[PDB]
Amino acid sequence: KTKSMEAYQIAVGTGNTDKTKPIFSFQMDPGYSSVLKRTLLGEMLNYYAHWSGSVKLTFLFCGSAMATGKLLISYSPPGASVPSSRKDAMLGTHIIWDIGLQSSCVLCVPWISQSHYRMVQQDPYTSAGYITCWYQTNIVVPPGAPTSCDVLCFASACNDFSVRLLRDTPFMAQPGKL
């Protein structure tokens, strides 16, 4: 699915199967998380060693206009495990997205870091939380509408976002002369 256009599309579907299972689940750190890295926010952080500020994850629905549902996307602060049920997800920070005319509801995750700046690299200390999406209500589609729709997550930064310590990006890793 990666090295393709299936990497960005979050497959949200009309079904009873695995609707108490996360639509997606990754770590909030744009720096070292394989999901939130290699994007504008993630690659921007990878050029630094310390980062701060709220991350807005804008979830754009890509499906039929007749499709309607509710997706509960939750940022869980560190200290516990990754959310395994929507009950554990709504305890932390969560946003309920009603699929509709807007269809681009954004989970603007807060800054609940213990320190002023988190670590871009894979550091167990001052790490971020986890982003998990769930089916608040199943996306009901008419017979003419496709059952399997998609979601695109957009990582962006707020007016509160900042980075501190410049560094060379580990992504490149130049082998030799070009």
Partner 1 sequence: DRTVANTQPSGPSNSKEIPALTAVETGHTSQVDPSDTLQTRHVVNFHSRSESTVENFMGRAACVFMDQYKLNGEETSTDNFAVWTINVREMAQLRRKCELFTYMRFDIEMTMVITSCQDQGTQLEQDMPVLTHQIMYVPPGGPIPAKVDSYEWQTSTNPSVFWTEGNAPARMSIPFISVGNAYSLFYDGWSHFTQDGTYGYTTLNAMGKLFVRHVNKSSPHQITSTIRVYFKPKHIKAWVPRPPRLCPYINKGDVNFVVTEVTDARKSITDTPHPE
Partner 2 sequence: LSLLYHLTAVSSPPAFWVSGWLGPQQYLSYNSLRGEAEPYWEKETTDLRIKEKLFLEAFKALGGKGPYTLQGLLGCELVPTAKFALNGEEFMNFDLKQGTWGGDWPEALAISQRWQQQDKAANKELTFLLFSCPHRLREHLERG
Partner 3 sequence: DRVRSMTLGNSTITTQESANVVVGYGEWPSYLSDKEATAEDQPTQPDVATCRFYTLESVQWEKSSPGWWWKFPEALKNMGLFGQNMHYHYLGRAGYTIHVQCNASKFHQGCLLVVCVPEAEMGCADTSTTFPATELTTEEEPHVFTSDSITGKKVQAAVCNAGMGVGVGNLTIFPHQWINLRTNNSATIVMPYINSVPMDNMFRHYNFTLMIIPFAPLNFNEGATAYVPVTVTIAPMYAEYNGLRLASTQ
Residue closer to its own copies by CB (options 52, 54) is 52
Classify residue 77 by its DSSP letter.
P
Contact 68, 138 (CB under 8 A): no
Size of the site for partner 1 (CB under 8 A): 95
Please name which of 147, 145, 57 lies closest in space to residue 107, comparing C-alpha atoms: 57
Interatomic CA distance for residues 117 and 115, integer angstroms: 5
Q: Is 87 in the site for its own copies (CB under 8 A)?
A: no
Mark 29-58 with x for binding to partner 1 (rule: CB under 8 A) and - for no binding.
Answer: --xxxxx-xxxx-xxx-xxxxx-xxx-x-x
Residue closer to partner 2 by CB (options 101, 172) is 172
Interatomic CA distance for residues 94 and 76, integer angstroms: 8
- CB-based contacts of 161: which residues, under 8 Å, 6+ apart? 51, 52, 53, 54, 55
Q: Is 21 in the site for its own copies (CB under 8 A)?
A: no
Report the site for partner 1 in 157-176 (rule: CB under 8 A).
Answer: 158-176
Interatomic CA distance for residues 134 and 107, integer angstroms: 13
CA angle 132, 133, 134 (to 5 degrees): 125
Report the site for partner 2 in 113-142 (rule: CB under 8 A).
Answer: 121-124
Report the site for its own copies in 95-134 (rule: CB under 8 A).
Answer: 116-117
Considering only 24, 26, 60, 121, the residue that binds partner 3 (CB under 8 A) is 60
Considering only 5, 101, 166, 173, the residue that binds partner 2 (CB under 8 A) is 173
Report the site for partner 1 in 103-142 (rule: CB under 8 A).
Answer: 103-111, 114-121, 123-127, 130, 132
Q: Which residues bind partner 2 (CB under 8 A)?
A: 27, 32, 121-124, 169-173, 177
